[PDB]
Amino acid sequence: KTHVQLSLPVLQVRDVLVRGFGDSVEEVLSEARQHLKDGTCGLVEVEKGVLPQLEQPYVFIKRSDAAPHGHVMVELVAELEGIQYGRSGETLGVLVPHVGEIPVAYRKVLLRK
C-alpha cells in the first residue's frame, strides 16, 4: 500500500531517550521509515525550545493534503543545518525512536510510504 494508518505515541521532549535517527538526511529518513513500519516511532510536538533539545538531522511529519478515518495524511521531510529535503504542508511534529517512553497522547496519521 502507498499509505498506512498509524497511531503514533506523542512524547514529551524531556522524556525522549534517543533524540534522533542518525547522522545524515538519508539515514534519518531511512531509520524513521523502518521505525514507523516496526511500530517503534514516537512523535514530539514542536514548540519553542523543543528542536534544540533534539539531534539533527530532524525528521518531520508534515500534512500532505486537506483525513481518512480520523487519520491526517502526512509525509516525511528531513532538515539539516536549516535545509529541508522534501516539500510538504504544516508540521505535525518531529519523529524520534520510541523505546518505551510513556506518551501523553496518540496522533492518528495516514503515512505516505
PDB file of N, CA and C in Angstrom, residues 3-71:
ATOM      1  N   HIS A   3      -0.116   4.033   1.302  1.00  0.00           N
ATOM      2  CA  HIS A   3      -0.387   4.702   2.601  1.00  0.00           C
ATOM      3  C   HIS A   3      -0.686   3.671   3.680  1.00  0.00           C
ATOM      4  N   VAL A   4      -0.271   3.965   4.911  1.00  0.00           N
ATOM      5  CA  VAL A   4      -0.518   3.060   6.063  1.00  0.00           C
ATOM      6  C   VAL A   4      -1.051   3.902   7.221  1.00  0.00           C
ATOM      7  N   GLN A   5      -2.137   3.426   7.828  1.00  0.00           N
ATOM      8  CA  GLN A   5      -2.771   4.035   9.018  1.00  0.00           C
ATOM      9  C   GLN A   5      -1.920   3.698  10.235  1.00  0.00           C
ATOM     10  N   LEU A   6      -1.400   4.716  10.910  1.00  0.00           N
ATOM     11  CA  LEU A   6      -0.579   4.538  12.129  1.00  0.00           C
ATOM     12  C   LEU A   6      -1.152   5.407  13.241  1.00  0.00           C
ATOM     13  N   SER A   7      -1.018   4.928  14.478  1.00  0.00           N
ATOM     14  CA  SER A   7      -1.302   5.690  15.721  1.00  0.00           C
ATOM     15  C   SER A   7       0.043   5.907  16.416  1.00  0.00           C
ATOM     16  N   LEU A   8       0.549   7.144  16.415  1.00  0.00           N
ATOM     17  CA  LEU A   8       1.915   7.445  16.899  1.00  0.00           C
ATOM     18  C   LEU A   8       1.836   7.949  18.327  1.00  0.00           C
ATOM     19  N   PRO A   9       2.639   7.373  19.245  1.00  0.00           N
ATOM     20  CA  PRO A   9       2.708   7.882  20.606  1.00  0.00           C
ATOM     21  C   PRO A   9       3.366   9.268  20.620  1.00  0.00           C
ATOM     22  N   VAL A  10       2.705  10.247  21.242  1.00  0.00           N
ATOM     23  CA  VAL A  10       3.210  11.629  21.351  1.00  0.00           C
ATOM     24  C   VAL A  10       4.024  11.688  22.657  1.00  0.00           C
ATOM     25  N   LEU A  11       5.301  12.022  22.565  1.00  0.00           N
ATOM     26  CA  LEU A  11       6.233  12.009  23.726  1.00  0.00           C
ATOM     27  C   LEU A  11       6.569  13.449  24.098  1.00  0.00           C
ATOM     28  N   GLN A  12       6.767  13.694  25.393  1.00  0.00           N
ATOM     29  CA  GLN A  12       7.358  14.960  25.895  1.00  0.00           C
ATOM     30  C   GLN A  12       8.851  14.947  25.554  1.00  0.00           C
ATOM     31  N   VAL A  13       9.377  16.056  25.043  1.00  0.00           N
ATOM     32  CA  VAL A  13      10.800  16.140  24.608  1.00  0.00           C
ATOM     33  C   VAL A  13      11.743  15.710  25.735  1.00  0.00           C
ATOM     34  N   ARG A  14      11.462  16.070  26.997  1.00  0.00           N
ATOM     35  CA  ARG A  14      12.391  15.736  28.122  1.00  0.00           C
ATOM     36  C   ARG A  14      12.355  14.253  28.520  1.00  0.00           C
ATOM     37  N   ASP A  15      11.388  13.478  28.041  1.00  0.00           N
ATOM     38  CA  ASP A  15      11.307  12.008  28.261  1.00  0.00           C
ATOM     39  C   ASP A  15      12.115  11.255  27.212  1.00  0.00           C
ATOM     40  N   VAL A  16      12.359  11.854  26.055  1.00  0.00           N
ATOM     41  CA  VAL A  16      12.914  11.093  24.916  1.00  0.00           C
ATOM     42  C   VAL A  16      14.336  10.623  25.226  1.00  0.00           C
ATOM     43  N   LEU A  17      14.570   9.317  25.170  1.00  0.00           N
ATOM     44  CA  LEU A  17      15.898   8.730  25.436  1.00  0.00           C
ATOM     45  C   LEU A  17      16.789   8.764  24.199  1.00  0.00           C
ATOM     46  N   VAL A  18      16.241   8.576  23.006  1.00  0.00           N
ATOM     47  CA  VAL A  18      17.081   8.552  21.783  1.00  0.00           C
ATOM     48  C   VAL A  18      16.576   9.692  20.907  1.00  0.00           C
ATOM     49  N   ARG A  19      17.384  10.741  20.780  1.00  0.00           N
ATOM     50  CA  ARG A  19      16.874  12.084  20.405  1.00  0.00           C
ATOM     51  C   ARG A  19      16.999  12.310  18.890  1.00  0.00           C
ATOM     52  N   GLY A  20      17.324  11.276  18.128  1.00  0.00           N
ATOM     53  CA  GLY A  20      17.246  11.323  16.658  1.00  0.00           C
ATOM     54  C   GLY A  20      17.484   9.960  16.073  1.00  0.00           C
ATOM     55  N   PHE A  21      17.498   9.891  14.748  1.00  0.00           N
ATOM     56  CA  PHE A  21      17.541   8.633  13.993  1.00  0.00           C
ATOM     57  C   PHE A  21      18.933   8.356  13.403  1.00  0.00           C
ATOM     58  N   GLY A  22      19.858   9.304  13.428  1.00  0.00           N
ATOM     59  CA  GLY A  22      21.183   9.069  12.839  1.00  0.00           C
ATOM     60  C   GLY A  22      21.778  10.361  12.331  1.00  0.00           C
ATOM     61  N   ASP A  23      22.702  10.247  11.396  1.00  0.00           N
ATOM     62  CA  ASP A  23      23.770  11.262  11.234  1.00  0.00           C
ATOM     63  C   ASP A  23      23.752  11.895   9.842  1.00  0.00           C
ATOM     64  N   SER A  24      22.879  11.442   8.944  1.00  0.00           N
ATOM     65  CA  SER A  24      22.731  12.000   7.578  1.00  0.00           C
ATOM     66  C   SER A  24      21.246  12.139   7.278  1.00  0.00           C
ATOM     67  N   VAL A  25      20.900  12.987   6.320  1.00  0.00           N
ATOM     68  CA  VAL A  25      19.480  13.146   5.899  1.00  0.00           C
ATOM     69  C   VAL A  25      18.992  11.780   5.417  1.00  0.00           C
ATOM     70  N   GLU A  26      19.791  11.089   4.606  1.00  0.00           N
ATOM     71  CA  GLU A  26      19.324   9.814   4.014  1.00  0.00           C
ATOM     72  C   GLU A  26      19.126   8.774   5.132  1.00  0.00           C
ATOM     73  N   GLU A  27      20.020   8.749   6.126  1.00  0.00           N
ATOM     74  CA  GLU A  27      19.910   7.740   7.217  1.00  0.00           C
ATOM     75  C   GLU A  27      18.677   8.045   8.070  1.00  0.00           C
ATOM     76  N   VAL A  28      18.410   9.303   8.377  1.00  0.00           N
ATOM     77  CA  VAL A  28      17.318   9.601   9.349  1.00  0.00           C
ATOM     78  C   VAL A  28      15.973   9.295   8.679  1.00  0.00           C
ATOM     79  N   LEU A  29      15.813   9.614   7.391  1.00  0.00           N
ATOM     80  CA  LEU A  29      14.586   9.262   6.629  1.00  0.00           C
ATOM     81  C   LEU A  29      14.424   7.753   6.558  1.00  0.00           C
ATOM     82  N   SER A  30      15.519   7.021   6.293  1.00  0.00           N
ATOM     83  CA  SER A  30      15.568   5.535   6.255  1.00  0.00           C
ATOM     84  C   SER A  30      15.100   4.948   7.583  1.00  0.00           C
ATOM     85  N   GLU A  31      15.776   5.359   8.654  1.00  0.00           N
ATOM     86  CA  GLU A  31      15.519   4.848  10.030  1.00  0.00           C
ATOM     87  C   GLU A  31      14.088   5.203  10.436  1.00  0.00           C
ATOM     88  N   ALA A  32      13.623   6.413  10.138  1.00  0.00           N
ATOM     89  CA  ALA A  32      12.260   6.874  10.513  1.00  0.00           C
ATOM     90  C   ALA A  32      11.229   5.924   9.873  1.00  0.00           C
ATOM     91  N   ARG A  33      11.418   5.633   8.583  1.00  0.00           N
ATOM     92  CA  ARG A  33      10.504   4.760   7.804  1.00  0.00           C
ATOM     93  C   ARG A  33      10.524   3.346   8.388  1.00  0.00           C
ATOM     94  N   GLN A  34      11.704   2.830   8.726  1.00  0.00           N
ATOM     95  CA  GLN A  34      11.810   1.490   9.360  1.00  0.00           C
ATOM     96  C   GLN A  34      11.071   1.476  10.718  1.00  0.00           C
ATOM     97  N   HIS A  35      11.345   2.437  11.598  1.00  0.00           N
ATOM     98  CA  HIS A  35      10.677   2.522  12.936  1.00  0.00           C
ATOM     99  C   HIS A  35       9.156   2.697  12.775  1.00  0.00           C
ATOM    100  N   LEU A  36       8.717   3.472  11.787  1.00  0.00           N
ATOM    101  CA  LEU A  36       7.264   3.617  11.514  1.00  0.00           C
ATOM    102  C   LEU A  36       6.665   2.260  11.130  1.00  0.00           C
ATOM    103  N   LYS A  37       7.323   1.500  10.258  1.00  0.00           N
ATOM    104  CA  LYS A  37       6.862   0.142   9.867  1.00  0.00           C
ATOM    105  C   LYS A  37       6.845  -0.770  11.105  1.00  0.00           C
ATOM    106  N   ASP A  38       7.838  -0.679  12.017  1.00  0.00           N
ATOM    107  CA  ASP A  38       8.077  -1.623  13.148  1.00  0.00           C
ATOM    108  C   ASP A  38       7.275  -1.222  14.398  1.00  0.00           C
ATOM    109  N   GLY A  39       6.575  -0.096  14.344  1.00  0.00           N
ATOM    110  CA  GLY A  39       5.755   0.400  15.458  1.00  0.00           C
ATOM    111  C   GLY A  39       6.608   0.939  16.585  1.00  0.00           C
ATOM    112  N   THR A  40       7.823   1.393  16.282  1.00  0.00           N
ATOM    113  CA  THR A  40       8.810   1.853  17.289  1.00  0.00           C
ATOM    114  C   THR A  40       9.174   3.321  17.011  1.00  0.00           C
ATOM    115  N   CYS A  41       8.206   4.121  16.591  1.00  0.00           N
ATOM    116  CA  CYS A  41       8.399   5.546  16.246  1.00  0.00           C
ATOM    117  C   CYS A  41       7.484   6.397  17.105  1.00  0.00           C
ATOM    118  N   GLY A  42       8.057   7.414  17.756  1.00  0.00           N
ATOM    119  CA  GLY A  42       7.281   8.399  18.507  1.00  0.00           C
ATOM    120  C   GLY A  42       7.253   9.738  17.811  1.00  0.00           C
ATOM    121  N   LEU A  43       6.426  10.637  18.334  1.00  0.00           N
ATOM    122  CA  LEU A  43       6.189  11.980  17.767  1.00  0.00           C
ATOM    123  C   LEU A  43       6.338  12.991  18.890  1.00  0.00           C
ATOM    124  N   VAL A  44       7.122  14.040  18.658  1.00  0.00           N
ATOM    125  CA  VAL A  44       7.244  15.216  19.559  1.00  0.00           C
ATOM    126  C   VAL A  44       6.663  16.451  18.869  1.00  0.00           C
ATOM    127  N   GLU A  45       5.711  17.088  19.530  1.00  0.00           N
ATOM    128  CA  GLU A  45       5.036  18.303  19.031  1.00  0.00           C
ATOM    129  C   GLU A  45       6.029  19.443  19.172  1.00  0.00           C
ATOM    130  N   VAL A  46       6.199  20.203  18.096  1.00  0.00           N
ATOM    131  CA  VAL A  46       7.246  21.251  18.022  1.00  0.00           C
ATOM    132  C   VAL A  46       6.657  22.496  18.681  1.00  0.00           C
ATOM    133  N   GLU A  47       7.354  23.004  19.693  1.00  0.00           N
ATOM    134  CA  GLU A  47       7.141  24.351  20.264  1.00  0.00           C
ATOM    135  C   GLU A  47       8.517  24.955  20.548  1.00  0.00           C
ATOM    136  N   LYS A  48       8.526  26.237  20.896  1.00  0.00           N
ATOM    137  CA  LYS A  48       9.730  26.972  21.352  1.00  0.00           C
ATOM    138  C   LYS A  48      10.530  26.050  22.270  1.00  0.00           C
ATOM    139  N   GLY A  49      11.792  25.832  21.926  1.00  0.00           N
ATOM    140  CA  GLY A  49      12.789  25.161  22.778  1.00  0.00           C
ATOM    141  C   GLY A  49      12.862  23.674  22.522  1.00  0.00           C
ATOM    142  N   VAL A  50      11.916  23.108  21.768  1.00  0.00           N
ATOM    143  CA  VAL A  50      11.920  21.633  21.522  1.00  0.00           C
ATOM    144  C   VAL A  50      13.079  21.246  20.616  1.00  0.00           C
ATOM    145  N   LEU A  51      13.190  21.808  19.404  1.00  0.00           N
ATOM    146  CA  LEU A  51      14.169  21.270  18.428  1.00  0.00           C
ATOM    147  C   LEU A  51      15.603  21.339  18.947  1.00  0.00           C
ATOM    148  N   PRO A  52      16.058  22.405  19.654  1.00  0.00           N
ATOM    149  CA  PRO A  52      17.436  22.418  20.157  1.00  0.00           C
ATOM    150  C   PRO A  52      17.734  21.277  21.152  1.00  0.00           C
ATOM    151  N   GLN A  53      16.695  20.658  21.730  1.00  0.00           N
ATOM    152  CA  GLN A  53      16.825  19.530  22.688  1.00  0.00           C
ATOM    153  C   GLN A  53      16.895  18.201  21.928  1.00  0.00           C
ATOM    154  N   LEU A  54      16.674  18.223  20.616  1.00  0.00           N
ATOM    155  CA  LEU A  54      16.729  17.005  19.775  1.00  0.00           C
ATOM    156  C   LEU A  54      17.952  17.089  18.880  1.00  0.00           C
ATOM    157  N   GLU A  55      18.290  15.978  18.243  1.00  0.00           N
ATOM    158  CA  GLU A  55      19.519  15.833  17.444  1.00  0.00           C
ATOM    159  C   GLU A  55      19.186  16.034  15.967  1.00  0.00           C
ATOM    160  N   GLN A  56      19.984  16.830  15.278  1.00  0.00           N
ATOM    161  CA  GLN A  56      19.950  16.912  13.793  1.00  0.00           C
ATOM    162  C   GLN A  56      20.711  15.757  13.160  1.00  0.00           C
ATOM    163  N   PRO A  57      20.395  15.344  11.906  1.00  0.00           N
ATOM    164  CA  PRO A  57      19.219  15.844  11.187  1.00  0.00           C
ATOM    165  C   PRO A  57      17.873  15.471  11.839  1.00  0.00           C
ATOM    166  N   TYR A  58      16.881  16.351  11.725  1.00  0.00           N
ATOM    167  CA  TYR A  58      15.478  16.127  12.147  1.00  0.00           C
ATOM    168  C   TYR A  58      14.672  15.447  11.035  1.00  0.00           C
ATOM    169  N   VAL A  59      13.708  14.612  11.441  1.00  0.00           N
ATOM    170  CA  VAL A  59      12.649  14.079  10.535  1.00  0.00           C
ATOM    171  C   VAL A  59      11.316  14.645  10.987  1.00  0.00           C
ATOM    172  N   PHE A  60      10.643  15.418  10.123  1.00  0.00           N
ATOM    173  CA  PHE A  60       9.299  15.964  10.424  1.00  0.00           C
ATOM    174  C   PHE A  60       8.256  15.069   9.766  1.00  0.00           C
ATOM    175  N   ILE A  61       7.079  14.971  10.379  1.00  0.00           N
ATOM    176  CA  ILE A  61       5.841  14.636   9.618  1.00  0.00           C
ATOM    177  C   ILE A  61       5.096  15.940   9.334  1.00  0.00           C
ATOM    178  N   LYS A  62       4.703  16.109   8.066  1.00  0.00           N
ATOM    179  CA  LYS A  62       4.057  17.320   7.530  1.00  0.00           C
ATOM    180  C   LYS A  62       2.755  16.918   6.817  1.00  0.00           C
ATOM    181  N   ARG A  63       1.698  17.686   7.022  1.00  0.00           N
ATOM    182  CA  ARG A  63       0.370  17.401   6.416  1.00  0.00           C
ATOM    183  C   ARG A  63       0.517  17.478   4.890  1.00  0.00           C
ATOM    184  N   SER A  64       0.060  16.452   4.174  1.00  0.00           N
ATOM    185  CA  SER A  64       0.333  16.280   2.721  1.00  0.00           C
ATOM    186  C   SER A  64      -0.926  16.607   1.916  1.00  0.00           C
ATOM    187  N   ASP A  65      -2.058  16.843   2.588  1.00  0.00           N
ATOM    188  CA  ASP A  65      -3.406  17.005   1.971  1.00  0.00           C
ATOM    189  C   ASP A  65      -4.394  17.551   3.028  1.00  0.00           C
ATOM    190  N   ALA A  66      -5.509  18.199   2.615  1.00  0.00           N
ATOM    191  CA  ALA A  66      -6.501  18.908   3.484  1.00  0.00           C
ATOM    192  C   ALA A  66      -7.878  18.220   3.502  1.00  0.00           C
ATOM    193  N   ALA A  67      -8.749  13.695   5.679  1.00  0.00           N
ATOM    194  CA  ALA A  67      -8.242  12.986   6.879  1.00  0.00           C
ATOM    195  C   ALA A  67      -8.975  11.656   7.027  1.00  0.00           C
ATOM    196  N   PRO A  68      -8.704  10.686   6.127  1.00  0.00           N
ATOM    197  CA  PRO A  68      -9.465   9.438   6.086  1.00  0.00           C
ATOM    198  C   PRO A  68      -9.503   8.702   7.431  1.00  0.00           C
ATOM    199  N   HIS A  69     -10.712   8.471   7.954  1.00  0.00           N
ATOM    200  CA  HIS A  69     -10.992   7.640   9.157  1.00  0.00           C
ATOM    201  C   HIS A  69     -10.435   8.295  10.433  1.00  0.00           C
ATOM    202  N   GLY A  70     -10.234   9.624  10.443  1.00  0.00           N
ATOM    203  CA  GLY A  70      -9.607  10.386  11.549  1.00  0.00           C
ATOM    204  C   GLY A  70      -8.092  10.549  11.393  1.00  0.00           C
ATOM    205  N   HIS A  71      -7.484   9.854  10.424  1.00  0.00           N
ATOM    206  CA  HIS A  71      -6.024   9.826  10.148  1.00  0.00           C
ATOM    207  C   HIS A  71      -5.624  10.929   9.160  1.00  0.00           C
TER     208      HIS A  71
END
